[PDB]
Write a protein that binds this ligand. Sequence first.
Ligand SMILES: NC(=O)c1cccnc1
Ligand SMILES: NC(=O)c1cccnc1
Lengths: 133, 133
Amino acid sequence: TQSPALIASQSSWRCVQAHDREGWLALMADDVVIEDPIGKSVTNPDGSGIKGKEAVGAFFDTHIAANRLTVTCEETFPSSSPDEIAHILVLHSEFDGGFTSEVRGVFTYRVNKAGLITNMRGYWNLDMMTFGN
Amino acid sequence: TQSPALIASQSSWRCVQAHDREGWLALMADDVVIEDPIGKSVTNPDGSGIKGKEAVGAFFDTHIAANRLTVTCEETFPSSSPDEIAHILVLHSEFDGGFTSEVRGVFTYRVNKAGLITNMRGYWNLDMMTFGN
Ligand SMILES: NC(=O)c1cccnc1
Ligand SMILES: NC(=O)c1cccnc1
């Protein structure tokens, strides 16, 4: 059977693809910190991550839903802990009325013993993005 | 110019390739924690990482030098922080008198403001290894 980390990460993309804000939030621990990406960027404006379920809900609204984000898993790297995993993901989204951008990055996930996501951290930056339209 | 994280990670493999224990240790913060891999494994026997420069020195001796470890960078994923970076690395080593094993994993690095490595964390497990001889 699949690890709690693999379940949580695969579920998180499934909820993105299903446009399911409630289902996505239900995967998150109360003390979740989302660093997508790690360091200061449009989607991490203060550089220290988006903290707690309310603010992460606003993050879903603006940076997953309103931008038509799609998430594709290219490759998966289990660790030796059932609660931590990494993936190469390709992110595609839309901006400024339908222009497109894409980025390929490493994303790490940690879950607690209950299986809820405590950390999602992305290794990318705006300079890595490629564009379309 | 290159980020402190990229410098520290590239330097760490250079020191491995140069068989340079002193140079490798000098890259590490006093509070370094090496989780290679994250979770319990032969190279992380208690599952919580190898902590501090003395124990990480013993780690170099047994699990880098005595096993003829080579480290190859396949791909690099900068974040939006100059102090955190991820790479896909291929590790090759020897055991039981010259039989070989190899593993391909995601490795994350964090440096402090001084540029010293505080965390190196690997996403792999024994089940991912491939063998030779
Ligand atoms: N797994 C996720 O829910 C995810 C990954 C990358 C960006 N946004 C959301
Ligand atoms: N970068 C390093 O010094 C390193 C990476 C993976 C395993 N051992 C050492």
